[PDB]
């Protein structure tokens, strides 16, 4: 065990059996950091900083996603909303920052196509490292993507530029030498 | 020492200073196998499974630089792929095969504008997690993001349905707590 990093990576998948749970011997402040320390300590291309993120729970979690689940309305396409409302203790959604990636469109009229695709880059590298890590912590997560049904339901207090990316709900190659 | 995913998250940035390192206990082929089972075990969303990536070294990684740095006129624009070249051991360049997507927006054509975003984010997924492990073997690594120009370069052993993304070169959160 050295770089054994990749253990931490291969020991990492989608997790649907969820329970409200702290989980034991760590509280809820542990996770406030562990996704704070990745957005602080990832890369986005040249310095834009665009990625952000927001962990809801409670009675705040539940109210988004019953707000989606009726948004939904065929009852099997809802199993997954009203199972992220009733079976988890929270969830981390993540954000991009389309003010700065507006403001690098600016002053570089001629880069102006890499810029919002080097800021997908960066938040799904946040998005990949706080969930190899909350399941390291001893939780289960996994993906989810109602963006524009999240986006909606989400609150005034948020900035209208935040992008919403992602919610984490959490509870070969080729090689020359020719 | 627990979930220190973190400790190798926070240890890792930018390096300039690379000299054709081995490095020292570690071979080519060891370096081959961190990047080859992050390809394999991150999550493509809906399975696409697009992830994909070439390992450049020798009179191979020079010729393609030196392609790179002669499309650059002006001096100050060739301080970077000259230095790639001839300061570098290698690069690791990453793909995201433009086949599975094209599919996905195929079937489902509702969804055909997620599809190059759940790419996007994938593929900035095995950038960080590849330079955040192969730091941690003891190798000096950057992002290089010369698209289209390494593109063209590129021989034609490569799918041309492969899209170049970029070039690894080895040598605060609201609560809402209410």
Redesign the interface.
């Known amino acids: 065990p050295?770089?054994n990093?990749?253990n931490?990576?291969?020991n990492?998948?989608?997790i649907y059996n969820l329970k409200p749970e702290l989980p034991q011997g760590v509280g809820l402040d542990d996770v406030?950091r562990?996704?704070?320390?990745?957005?602080?300590?990832?890369?986005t291309?040249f310095n834009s900083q665009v990625n952000?993120?927001?962990?809801?729970?409670?009675d705040?979690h539940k109210r988004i996603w019953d707000a989606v689940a009726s948004a939904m309305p065929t009852a099997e396409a809802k199993k997954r909303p009203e199972s992220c409302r009733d079976e988890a203790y929270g969830s981390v959604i993540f954000f991009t920052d389309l003010g700065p990636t507006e403001k690098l469109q600016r002053d570089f009229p001629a880069l102006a196509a890499?810029f919002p695709?080097?800021a997908?880059?960066?938040?799904?590298?946040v998005?990949?490292?706080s969930w190899?890590?909350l399941e390291?912590?001893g939780l289960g997560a996994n993906?989810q993507?109602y963006?524009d049904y999240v986006k909606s339901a989400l609150?005034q207090?948020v900035p209208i530029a935040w992008t919403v990316?992602?919610q984490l709900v959490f509870g070969?190659?080729?090689?020359?030498?020719?």
Chains 1, 2 share one sequence.
Do not use: E, F, W
């Open positions: 050295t770089g990093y990749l931490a990576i291969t990492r998948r989608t406030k562990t996704v704070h320390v990745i957005l602080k300590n990832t890369p291309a952000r993120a927001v962990i809801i729970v409670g705040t890499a695709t080097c997908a880059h960066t938040t799904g590298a998005q990949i490292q190899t890590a390291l912590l993906l993507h963006n609150p207090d990316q992602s070969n190659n080729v090689i020359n030498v020719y």
